Amino acid sequence: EQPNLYLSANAAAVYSVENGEALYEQNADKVMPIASLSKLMTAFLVLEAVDNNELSWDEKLDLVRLDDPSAVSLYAITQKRTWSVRDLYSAMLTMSANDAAETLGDRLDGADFPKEMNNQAKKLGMSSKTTFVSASGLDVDGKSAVSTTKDLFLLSSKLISTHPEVLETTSKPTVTTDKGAKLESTNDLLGSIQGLDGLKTGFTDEAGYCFIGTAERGGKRVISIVLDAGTAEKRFKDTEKLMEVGFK
Ligand SMILES: [Mg+2]
Ligand SMILES: [Mg+2]
Ligand SMILES: [Mg+2]
C-alpha cells in the first residue's frame, strides 16, 4: 500500500499537493517542535502584507537584538543593523536568520505578532495541534512552536498556492541581497534533486534536524516533511527517500 521506509526522522510524510493524498506517513499526527519552520508562517504574513498594500519591500528596518547567543542571526555575520524588508525576508528564508524574522514580525504587529500567526493558522484551516510562539520559531519563556506533519503540509501548500513567488527565493542556493551581502541557503538539496525548489530547514537540540521539501515534476507537486532527524545530512537523506515515494 504505502512503502516501508527507514528514516532518521521521528515524524515524516510526503503529500500530493493536487488532491492532498498522503503518499507516506509516519507519526503524522504527533505534536513536534518545529523551530525555524515557523518562518514559513512569518513569510506568509509578510507576503500577504505586501499584496494588501500594508508593507513595502523597500522599507528599512532595524534588526532586533536576540538574547539567545546560539541563535542564527543576520547581524552576527554582517554587523549591519539596518536592512530592507526584501533583504530581511531573504535572510529569514535562505539562512534562517532569527533576528530578521523577529524584525519583520515586529513591523507587522509589534508584540502581538504570535497572535496573528495563530490567527492565520486558524483562518487557513490548520488544526488545534499547531501553536506558534514567535516570528522566528525561537522558544519564548519555555514555550515552543509546535505542529504536525499534517498541519505543516497545509501551511506549506497554502503558502505556495497563494504566493507561488516564494519559490523564486527558496530555490536559490545563494541570494545576493540588495545591500550587497551574499547569503547561503541552508537547503543542501538544491541542484541535487530534480525539480526541487524549496522549502525550509529547522534545527534545535529539541526539534532535531528538520526540513520541509517541495518539488514539481510533470505538473505534479509534492511536499515532504521531515522532523527530528539525527544530523543535518540525515534530514536530507530522508527527504531523498520521500521524494522517491512522492514521484513513484
Ligand atoms: Mg490574503
Ligand atoms: Mg505573493
Ligand atoms: Mg531528541
PDB file of C-alpha atoms and ligand atoms in Angstrom:
ATOM      1  CA  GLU A   1       0.000   0.000   0.000  1.00  0.00           C
ATOM      2  CA  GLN A   2       2.356   2.666   1.284  1.00  0.00           C
ATOM      3  CA  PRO A   3       6.080   1.859   1.225  1.00  0.00           C
ATOM      4  CA  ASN A   4       8.237   0.684   4.090  1.00  0.00           C
ATOM      5  CA  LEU A   5      10.798   3.431   4.678  1.00  0.00           C
ATOM      6  CA  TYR A   6      13.571   3.537   7.230  1.00  0.00           C
ATOM      7  CA  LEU A   7      14.114   7.180   8.073  1.00  0.00           C
ATOM      8  CA  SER A   8      16.100   9.007  10.723  1.00  0.00           C
ATOM      9  CA  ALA A   9      13.210  11.403  11.230  1.00  0.00           C
ATOM     10  CA  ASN A  10      10.907  10.661  14.136  1.00  0.00           C
ATOM     11  CA  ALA A  11       7.978  12.124  12.179  1.00  0.00           C
ATOM     12  CA  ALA A  12       7.819  12.266   8.402  1.00  0.00           C
ATOM     13  CA  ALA A  13       5.446  12.417   5.476  1.00  0.00           C
ATOM     14  CA  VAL A  14       5.095  13.258   1.820  1.00  0.00           C
ATOM     15  CA  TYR A  15       1.887  14.524   0.226  1.00  0.00           C
ATOM     16  CA  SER A  16       0.482  15.255  -3.214  1.00  0.00           C
ATOM     17  CA  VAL A  17      -0.474  18.934  -3.478  1.00  0.00           C
ATOM     18  CA  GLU A  18      -3.080  18.398  -6.193  1.00  0.00           C
ATOM     19  CA  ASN A  19      -5.505  16.253  -4.185  1.00  0.00           C
ATOM     20  CA  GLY A  20      -3.984  16.168  -0.696  1.00  0.00           C
ATOM     21  CA  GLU A  21      -3.221  12.440  -0.786  1.00  0.00           C
ATOM     22  CA  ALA A  22      -0.740  11.207   1.808  1.00  0.00           C
ATOM     23  CA  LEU A  23       1.812   9.063  -0.062  1.00  0.00           C
ATOM     24  CA  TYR A  24       3.749   8.198   3.093  1.00  0.00           C
ATOM     25  CA  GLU A  25       3.075   8.999   6.743  1.00  0.00           C
ATOM     26  CA  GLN A  26       4.982   8.229   9.924  1.00  0.00           C
ATOM     27  CA  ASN A  27       3.775   9.795  13.190  1.00  0.00           C
ATOM     28  CA  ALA A  28       1.862  12.315  11.069  1.00  0.00           C
ATOM     29  CA  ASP A  29      -0.441  13.246  13.965  1.00  0.00           C
ATOM     30  CA  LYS A  30       2.347  13.578  16.546  1.00  0.00           C
ATOM     31  CA  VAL A  31       2.896  17.038  18.033  1.00  0.00           C
ATOM     32  CA  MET A  32       6.503  18.083  17.351  1.00  0.00           C
ATOM     33  CA  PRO A  33       8.688  21.156  17.928  1.00  0.00           C
ATOM     34  CA  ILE A  34       9.178  22.929  14.606  1.00  0.00           C
ATOM     35  CA  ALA A  35      11.678  25.720  15.365  1.00  0.00           C
ATOM     36  CA  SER A  36      12.561  27.799  12.260  1.00  0.00           C
ATOM     37  CA  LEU A  37       9.856  26.107  10.181  1.00  0.00           C
ATOM     38  CA  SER A  38       7.821  28.833  11.921  1.00  0.00           C
ATOM     39  CA  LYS A  39       9.392  31.269   9.473  1.00  0.00           C
ATOM     40  CA  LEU A  40       7.077  29.945   6.753  1.00  0.00           C
ATOM     41  CA  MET A  41       4.131  31.491   8.590  1.00  0.00           C
ATOM     42  CA  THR A  42       6.037  34.735   9.041  1.00  0.00           C
ATOM     43  CA  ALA A  43       6.828  34.644   5.287  1.00  0.00           C
ATOM     44  CA  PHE A  44       3.129  34.102   4.519  1.00  0.00           C
ATOM     45  CA  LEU A  45       2.159  37.130   6.577  1.00  0.00           C
ATOM     46  CA  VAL A  46       4.883  39.322   5.022  1.00  0.00           C
ATOM     47  CA  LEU A  47       3.730  38.357   1.535  1.00  0.00           C
ATOM     48  CA  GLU A  48       0.065  38.998   2.462  1.00  0.00           C
ATOM     49  CA  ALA A  49       1.007  42.443   3.805  1.00  0.00           C
ATOM     50  CA  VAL A  50       2.755  43.420   0.600  1.00  0.00           C
ATOM     51  CA  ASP A  51      -0.155  42.248  -1.582  1.00  0.00           C
ATOM     52  CA  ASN A  52      -2.606  44.059   0.689  1.00  0.00           C
ATOM     53  CA  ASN A  53      -0.709  47.356   0.385  1.00  0.00           C
ATOM     54  CA  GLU A  54       0.312  47.257   4.060  1.00  0.00           C
ATOM     55  CA  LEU A  55       4.073  46.758   3.645  1.00  0.00           C
ATOM     56  CA  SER A  56       6.684  47.823   1.091  1.00  0.00           C
ATOM     57  CA  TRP A  57       9.734  45.808   0.072  1.00  0.00           C
ATOM     58  CA  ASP A  58      11.949  48.907   0.372  1.00  0.00           C
ATOM     59  CA  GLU A  59      11.093  49.817   3.971  1.00  0.00           C
ATOM     60  CA  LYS A  60      14.271  49.823   6.070  1.00  0.00           C
ATOM     61  CA  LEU A  61      14.057  48.157   9.453  1.00  0.00           C
ATOM     62  CA  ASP A  62      16.468  47.753  12.354  1.00  0.00           C
ATOM     63  CA  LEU A  63      17.413  44.220  13.364  1.00  0.00           C
ATOM     64  CA  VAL A  64      16.166  43.299  16.813  1.00  0.00           C
ATOM     65  CA  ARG A  65      18.788  42.128  19.300  1.00  0.00           C
ATOM     66  CA  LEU A  66      18.497  38.468  20.251  1.00  0.00           C
ATOM     67  CA  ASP A  67      19.139  37.396  23.836  1.00  0.00           C
ATOM     68  CA  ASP A  68      19.903  33.841  22.681  1.00  0.00           C
ATOM     69  CA  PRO A  69      23.665  33.591  21.911  1.00  0.00           C
ATOM     70  CA  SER A  70      23.388  30.354  19.915  1.00  0.00           C
ATOM     71  CA  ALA A  71      20.665  31.593  17.552  1.00  0.00           C
ATOM     72  CA  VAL A  72      21.483  32.111  13.870  1.00  0.00           C
ATOM     73  CA  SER A  73      21.424  35.794  13.055  1.00  0.00           C
ATOM     74  CA  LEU A  74      21.982  38.150  10.173  1.00  0.00           C
ATOM     75  CA  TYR A  75      23.639  40.733  12.398  1.00  0.00           C
ATOM     76  CA  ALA A  76      26.285  38.311  13.686  1.00  0.00           C
ATOM     77  CA  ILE A  77      27.733  37.668  10.238  1.00  0.00           C
ATOM     78  CA  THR A  78      27.311  41.172   8.735  1.00  0.00           C
ATOM     79  CA  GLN A  79      27.421  43.619  11.659  1.00  0.00           C
ATOM     80  CA  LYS A  80      24.844  45.718   9.781  1.00  0.00           C
ATOM     81  CA  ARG A  81      21.778  46.792  11.749  1.00  0.00           C
ATOM     82  CA  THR A  82      19.517  48.235   9.058  1.00  0.00           C
ATOM     83  CA  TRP A  83      18.086  46.245   6.119  1.00  0.00           C
ATOM     84  CA  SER A  84      15.284  46.417   3.589  1.00  0.00           C
ATOM     85  CA  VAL A  85      12.198  44.270   4.122  1.00  0.00           C
ATOM     86  CA  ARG A  86      13.226  42.437   0.943  1.00  0.00           C
ATOM     87  CA  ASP A  87      16.632  41.579   2.377  1.00  0.00           C
ATOM     88  CA  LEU A  88      15.176  40.609   5.774  1.00  0.00           C
ATOM     89  CA  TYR A  89      12.696  38.295   4.048  1.00  0.00           C
ATOM     90  CA  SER A  90      15.529  36.753   2.005  1.00  0.00           C
ATOM     91  CA  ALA A  91      17.718  36.302   5.105  1.00  0.00           C
ATOM     92  CA  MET A  92      14.879  34.690   7.041  1.00  0.00           C
ATOM     93  CA  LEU A  93      14.125  32.136   4.312  1.00  0.00           C
ATOM     94  CA  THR A  94      17.650  31.484   2.999  1.00  0.00           C
ATOM     95  CA  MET A  95      19.983  31.431   6.021  1.00  0.00           C
ATOM     96  CA  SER A  96      17.273  31.126   8.694  1.00  0.00           C
ATOM     97  CA  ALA A  97      18.112  34.478  10.291  1.00  0.00           C
ATOM     98  CA  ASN A  98      16.149  34.701  13.547  1.00  0.00           C
ATOM     99  CA  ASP A  99      16.678  38.409  14.057  1.00  0.00           C
ATOM    100  CA  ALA A 100      15.368  39.131  10.533  1.00  0.00           C
ATOM    101  CA  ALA A 101      12.194  37.178  11.296  1.00  0.00           C
ATOM    102  CA  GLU A 102      11.619  38.933  14.632  1.00  0.00           C
ATOM    103  CA  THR A 103      12.162  42.329  12.998  1.00  0.00           C
ATOM    104  CA  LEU A 104       9.551  41.584  10.322  1.00  0.00           C
ATOM    105  CA  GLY A 105       7.023  40.348  12.887  1.00  0.00           C
ATOM    106  CA  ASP A 106       7.567  43.489  14.989  1.00  0.00           C
ATOM    107  CA  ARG A 107       6.957  45.730  11.975  1.00  0.00           C
ATOM    108  CA  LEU A 108       3.743  43.892  11.147  1.00  0.00           C
ATOM    109  CA  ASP A 109       2.087  43.603  14.570  1.00  0.00           C
ATOM    110  CA  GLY A 110       4.526  44.543  17.328  1.00  0.00           C
ATOM    111  CA  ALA A 111       4.413  42.291  20.377  1.00  0.00           C
ATOM    112  CA  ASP A 112       1.152  40.767  19.121  1.00  0.00           C
ATOM    113  CA  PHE A 113       2.630  39.023  16.080  1.00  0.00           C
ATOM    114  CA  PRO A 114       2.402  35.471  17.515  1.00  0.00           C
ATOM    115  CA  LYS A 115      -1.343  36.009  17.965  1.00  0.00           C
ATOM    116  CA  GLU A 116      -1.565  36.969  14.289  1.00  0.00           C
ATOM    117  CA  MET A 117       0.433  33.874  13.319  1.00  0.00           C
ATOM    118  CA  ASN A 118      -2.036  31.679  15.200  1.00  0.00           C
ATOM    119  CA  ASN A 119      -4.995  33.623  13.807  1.00  0.00           C
ATOM    120  CA  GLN A 120      -3.734  32.916  10.302  1.00  0.00           C
ATOM    121  CA  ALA A 121      -3.190  29.252  11.180  1.00  0.00           C
ATOM    122  CA  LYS A 122      -6.863  29.012  12.133  1.00  0.00           C
ATOM    123  CA  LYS A 123      -8.008  31.038   9.123  1.00  0.00           C
ATOM    124  CA  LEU A 124      -6.076  28.736   6.801  1.00  0.00           C
ATOM    125  CA  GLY A 125      -7.554  25.592   8.325  1.00  0.00           C
ATOM    126  CA  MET A 126      -4.670  24.267  10.429  1.00  0.00           C
ATOM    127  CA  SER A 127      -5.579  22.067  13.397  1.00  0.00           C
ATOM    128  CA  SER A 128      -5.598  22.800  17.113  1.00  0.00           C
ATOM    129  CA  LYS A 129      -2.313  20.896  17.410  1.00  0.00           C
ATOM    130  CA  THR A 130      -0.383  23.833  15.922  1.00  0.00           C
ATOM    131  CA  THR A 131       0.795  26.780  18.033  1.00  0.00           C
ATOM    132  CA  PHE A 132       3.306  29.458  17.053  1.00  0.00           C
ATOM    133  CA  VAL A 133       5.147  31.361  19.784  1.00  0.00           C
ATOM    134  CA  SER A 134       7.387  33.776  17.860  1.00  0.00           C
ATOM    135  CA  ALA A 135       8.109  35.096  14.361  1.00  0.00           C
ATOM    136  CA  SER A 136      11.404  33.189  14.283  1.00  0.00           C
ATOM    137  CA  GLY A 137      10.389  29.982  15.981  1.00  0.00           C
ATOM    138  CA  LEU A 138      12.782  30.609  18.866  1.00  0.00           C
ATOM    139  CA  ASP A 139      11.345  29.476  22.213  1.00  0.00           C
ATOM    140  CA  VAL A 140       9.624  32.107  24.339  1.00  0.00           C
ATOM    141  CA  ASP A 141       9.634  31.669  28.126  1.00  0.00           C
ATOM    142  CA  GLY A 142       9.858  27.891  27.892  1.00  0.00           C
ATOM    143  CA  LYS A 143       7.176  27.658  25.219  1.00  0.00           C
ATOM    144  CA  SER A 144       7.988  26.018  21.871  1.00  0.00           C
ATOM    145  CA  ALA A 145       6.428  26.369  18.452  1.00  0.00           C
ATOM    146  CA  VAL A 146       4.796  23.026  17.644  1.00  0.00           C
ATOM    147  CA  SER A 147       2.842  21.403  14.822  1.00  0.00           C
ATOM    148  CA  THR A 148       2.286  18.082  12.986  1.00  0.00           C
ATOM    149  CA  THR A 149       3.343  16.888   9.542  1.00  0.00           C
ATOM    150  CA  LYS A 150      -0.304  17.185   8.513  1.00  0.00           C
ATOM    151  CA  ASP A 151      -0.538  20.838   9.598  1.00  0.00           C
ATOM    152  CA  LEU A 152       2.878  21.679   8.126  1.00  0.00           C
ATOM    153  CA  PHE A 153       1.731  20.259   4.775  1.00  0.00           C
ATOM    154  CA  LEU A 154      -1.319  22.540   4.895  1.00  0.00           C
ATOM    155  CA  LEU A 155       0.729  25.620   5.767  1.00  0.00           C
ATOM    156  CA  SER A 156       3.298  24.900   3.073  1.00  0.00           C
ATOM    157  CA  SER A 157       0.664  24.135   0.428  1.00  0.00           C
ATOM    158  CA  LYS A 158      -1.290  27.313   1.247  1.00  0.00           C
ATOM    159  CA  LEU A 159       1.898  29.381   1.172  1.00  0.00           C
ATOM    160  CA  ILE A 160       2.919  28.002  -2.226  1.00  0.00           C
ATOM    161  CA  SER A 161      -0.570  28.203  -3.819  1.00  0.00           C
ATOM    162  CA  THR A 162      -1.259  31.727  -2.519  1.00  0.00           C
ATOM    163  CA  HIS A 163       2.262  33.062  -3.084  1.00  0.00           C
ATOM    164  CA  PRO A 164       3.966  30.922  -5.749  1.00  0.00           C
ATOM    165  CA  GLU A 165       6.758  33.507  -5.951  1.00  0.00           C
ATOM    166  CA  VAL A 166       8.050  32.260  -2.585  1.00  0.00           C
ATOM    167  CA  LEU A 167       9.799  29.537  -4.583  1.00  0.00           C
ATOM    168  CA  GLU A 168      11.714  32.213  -6.507  1.00  0.00           C
ATOM    169  CA  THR A 169      13.600  32.829  -3.254  1.00  0.00           C
ATOM    170  CA  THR A 170      13.688  29.322  -1.759  1.00  0.00           C
ATOM    171  CA  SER A 171      15.066  27.784  -4.961  1.00  0.00           C
ATOM    172  CA  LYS A 172      18.232  29.905  -4.825  1.00  0.00           C
ATOM    173  CA  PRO A 173      21.400  28.306  -3.381  1.00  0.00           C
ATOM    174  CA  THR A 174      22.785  31.814  -2.813  1.00  0.00           C
ATOM    175  CA  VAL A 175      20.927  35.126  -2.565  1.00  0.00           C
ATOM    176  CA  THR A 176      22.675  38.425  -3.229  1.00  0.00           C
ATOM    177  CA  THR A 177      20.953  40.960  -1.031  1.00  0.00           C
ATOM    178  CA  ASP A 178      20.140  44.425  -2.260  1.00  0.00           C
ATOM    179  CA  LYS A 179      22.594  45.742   0.340  1.00  0.00           C
ATOM    180  CA  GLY A 180      25.285  43.584  -1.267  1.00  0.00           C
ATOM    181  CA  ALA A 181      25.977  40.709   1.135  1.00  0.00           C
ATOM    182  CA  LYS A 182      25.591  37.196  -0.248  1.00  0.00           C
ATOM    183  CA  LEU A 183      23.576  34.751   1.833  1.00  0.00           C
ATOM    184  CA  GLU A 184      23.928  30.964   1.619  1.00  0.00           C
ATOM    185  CA  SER A 185      20.940  28.633   1.593  1.00  0.00           C
ATOM    186  CA  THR A 186      20.585  26.025   4.310  1.00  0.00           C
ATOM    187  CA  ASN A 187      18.825  23.802   1.735  1.00  0.00           C
ATOM    188  CA  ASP A 188      21.580  21.415   0.666  1.00  0.00           C
ATOM    189  CA  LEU A 189      19.349  19.550  -1.817  1.00  0.00           C
ATOM    190  CA  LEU A 190      19.016  22.415  -4.282  1.00  0.00           C
ATOM    191  CA  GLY A 191      20.534  21.150  -7.532  1.00  0.00           C
ATOM    192  CA  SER A 192      20.646  17.574  -6.199  1.00  0.00           C
ATOM    193  CA  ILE A 193      17.004  16.568  -6.639  1.00  0.00           C
ATOM    194  CA  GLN A 194      15.475  17.416  -9.987  1.00  0.00           C
ATOM    195  CA  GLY A 195      12.509  19.741  -9.649  1.00  0.00           C
ATOM    196  CA  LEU A 196      13.217  20.599  -6.002  1.00  0.00           C
ATOM    197  CA  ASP A 197      12.625  24.304  -5.357  1.00  0.00           C
ATOM    198  CA  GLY A 198      12.039  24.621  -1.603  1.00  0.00           C
ATOM    199  CA  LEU A 199      11.246  24.975   1.136  1.00  0.00           C
ATOM    200  CA  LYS A 200      12.722  25.412   4.641  1.00  0.00           C
ATOM    201  CA  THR A 201      15.060  23.886   7.242  1.00  0.00           C
ATOM    202  CA  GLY A 202      14.920  23.932  11.026  1.00  0.00           C
ATOM    203  CA  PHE A 203      17.226  22.845  13.839  1.00  0.00           C
ATOM    204  CA  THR A 204      17.396  22.850  17.615  1.00  0.00           C
ATOM    205  CA  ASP A 205      18.524  20.130  20.015  1.00  0.00           C
ATOM    206  CA  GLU A 206      14.859  19.617  20.957  1.00  0.00           C
ATOM    207  CA  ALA A 207      13.416  19.680  17.417  1.00  0.00           C
ATOM    208  CA  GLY A 208      16.321  17.807  15.866  1.00  0.00           C
ATOM    209  CA  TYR A 209      17.125  18.392  12.203  1.00  0.00           C
ATOM    210  CA  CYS A 210      14.036  19.336  10.215  1.00  0.00           C
ATOM    211  CA  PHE A 211      13.198  20.047   6.585  1.00  0.00           C
ATOM    212  CA  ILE A 212      10.122  20.832   4.523  1.00  0.00           C
ATOM    213  CA  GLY A 213      10.864  19.998   0.901  1.00  0.00           C
ATOM    214  CA  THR A 214       8.873  20.647  -2.246  1.00  0.00           C
ATOM    215  CA  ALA A 215       9.377  19.594  -5.860  1.00  0.00           C
ATOM    216  CA  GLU A 216       7.302  19.628  -9.043  1.00  0.00           C
ATOM    217  CA  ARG A 217       7.579  17.183 -11.960  1.00  0.00           C
ATOM    218  CA  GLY A 218       5.181  16.745 -14.861  1.00  0.00           C
ATOM    219  CA  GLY A 219       2.737  19.237 -13.368  1.00  0.00           C
ATOM    220  CA  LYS A 220       2.552  17.304 -10.093  1.00  0.00           C
ATOM    221  CA  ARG A 221       3.883  18.956  -6.945  1.00  0.00           C
ATOM    222  CA  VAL A 222       4.687  17.135  -3.724  1.00  0.00           C
ATOM    223  CA  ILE A 223       5.578  18.431  -0.281  1.00  0.00           C
ATOM    224  CA  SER A 224       7.759  16.401   2.075  1.00  0.00           C
ATOM    225  CA  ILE A 225       8.056  16.896   5.833  1.00  0.00           C
ATOM    226  CA  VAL A 226      10.980  15.662   7.980  1.00  0.00           C
ATOM    227  CA  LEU A 227      11.008  16.327  11.736  1.00  0.00           C
ATOM    228  CA  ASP A 228      13.711  15.375  14.268  1.00  0.00           C
ATOM    229  CA  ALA A 229      16.275  13.630  12.090  1.00  0.00           C
ATOM    230  CA  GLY A 230      19.591  12.966  13.839  1.00  0.00           C
ATOM    231  CA  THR A 231      22.026  15.008  11.729  1.00  0.00           C
ATOM    232  CA  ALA A 232      21.854  17.693   9.041  1.00  0.00           C
ATOM    233  CA  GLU A 233      22.834  15.070   6.465  1.00  0.00           C
ATOM    234  CA  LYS A 234      20.151  12.633   7.602  1.00  0.00           C
ATOM    235  CA  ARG A 235      17.270  15.077   7.169  1.00  0.00           C
ATOM    236  CA  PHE A 236      18.238  15.354   3.510  1.00  0.00           C
ATOM    237  CA  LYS A 237      18.784  11.595   3.070  1.00  0.00           C
ATOM    238  CA  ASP A 238      15.278  11.113   4.455  1.00  0.00           C
ATOM    239  CA  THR A 239      13.961  13.736   2.036  1.00  0.00           C
ATOM    240  CA  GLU A 240      15.542  11.870  -0.891  1.00  0.00           C
ATOM    241  CA  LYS A 241      13.619   8.734   0.102  1.00  0.00           C
ATOM    242  CA  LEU A 242      10.366  10.675   0.484  1.00  0.00           C
ATOM    243  CA  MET A 243      10.758  12.394  -2.887  1.00  0.00           C
ATOM    244  CA  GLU A 244      11.288   8.960  -4.495  1.00  0.00           C
ATOM    245  CA  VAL A 245       7.979   7.822  -2.977  1.00  0.00           C
ATOM    246  CA  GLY A 246       6.314  11.091  -3.916  1.00  0.00           C
ATOM    247  CA  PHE A 247       7.011  10.577  -7.617  1.00  0.00           C
ATOM    248  CA  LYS A 248       6.780   6.780  -7.718  1.00  0.00           C
TER     249      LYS A 248
HETATM  250 MG    MG B   1      -4.994  37.463   1.519  1.00  0.00          MG
HETATM  251 MG    MG B   2       2.705  36.961  -3.008  1.00  0.00          MG
HETATM  252 MG    MG B   3      15.679  14.495  20.962  1.00  0.00          MG
END
